[PDB]
């Protein structure tokens, strides 16, 4: 019983964090094999010019007390790809994957090249995440673990004026096309991911929370017309709810009607501790936490 936003265990990723310092700048890097990846703003902008006048010896890269020699540096989008003189023997089996809006992953928040905290997040429709980071957090990785393979999907880059957080993928591509520049950028509007809200309500039912459950139904078509005027995403397919609908005996259409009434008001009650709809849980997370 219960539903909690949780992270996958961080041990295999902890051994990959390094401190990367250049001049007056210090942040985190990800050490895999003989390469360290970090946000390129550590050398700050004309980033190509910055790279062109780099002195390799002005780097200080360390894993705990172990310093790494810098062999070479190349640009990789919004990242530096830094070749170092030692292989990380604790490199896990890994992949890279760019995540899509609505998908969950884990953040390992790091400072001074050491992991400080771990928490789960979900990529918003405007390509930002609801993080907690202060200065020095850049280079903190986002990851998922599948079959012991670590899928790296995020390296922290910056915070927007509103306080929400933007990273790049490990290919160096900034999520949402935000610039790694100290300029005025404002994140786009975001909508609640209806598919995730549905997952949350199924979790609520499985946990005995039913007070909000509509007798009424709304067809997916009609809901989607309401959704786009009311800050929620459209539902196109409902395959991801077959298991949960079978486990509970409640179909998506009844939950969609419930969403409509709960979007405006929870009326002073709570659902699993929440007083407003949440879209931070995917169907995958819910199925895992309910059924293993």
């Amino acid at each position: 019983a219960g539903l909690r936003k949780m992270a996958q265990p961080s041990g295999v990723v902890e051994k990959c964090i390094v401190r990367v310092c250049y001049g007056n700048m210090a942040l985190n890097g990800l050490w895999l094999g003989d390469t360290v990846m970090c946000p390129r703003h550590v050398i700050a902008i004309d980033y190509d010019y910055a790279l062109s006048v780099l002195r390799l010896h002005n780097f200080s890269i360390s894993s705990g007390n172990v310093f790494l020699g810098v062999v070479g540096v190349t640009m990789r989008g919004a990242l530096l790809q830094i070749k170092v003189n030692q292989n990380n023997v604790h490199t896990p089996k890994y992949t890279y994957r760019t995540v899509r809006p609505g998908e969950s992953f884990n953040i390992l928040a790091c400072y001074d090249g050491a992991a400080a905290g771990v928490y789960g997040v979900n990529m918003r429709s405007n390509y930002t995440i609801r993080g907690s980071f202060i200065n020095g957090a850049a280079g903190s990785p986002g990851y998922n673990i599948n079959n012991g393979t670590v899928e790296f999907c995020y390296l922290h880059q910056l915070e927007l004026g509103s306080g929400c957080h933007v990273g790049s993928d490990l290919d160096g591509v900034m999520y949402g096309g935000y610039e790694d520049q100290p300029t005025l950028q404002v994140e786009g509007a975001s909508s609640l991911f209806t598919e995730n809200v549905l997952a949350f309500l199924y979790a609520a039912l499985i946990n005995g929370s039913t007070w909000w459950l509509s007798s009424s139904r709304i067809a997916v078509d009609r809901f989607n017309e309401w959704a786009v005027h009311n800050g929620m995403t459209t539902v196109v397919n409902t395959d991801c709810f077959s298991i949960l609908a079978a486990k509970t005996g409640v179909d998506v259409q009844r939950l969609l009607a419930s969403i409509q009434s709960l979007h405006k008001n929870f009326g002073g009650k709570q659902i699993l501790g929440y007083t407003s709809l949440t879209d931070e849980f995917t169907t995958g997370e819910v199925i895992r936490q309910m059924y293993g």
Binding site: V42, D112, G136, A137, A138, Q157, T183
Partner: peptide, 7 residues
Amino acid sequence: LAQLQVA
């Protein structure tokens, strides 16, 4: 002012 979170 975007804040690039380097220390």
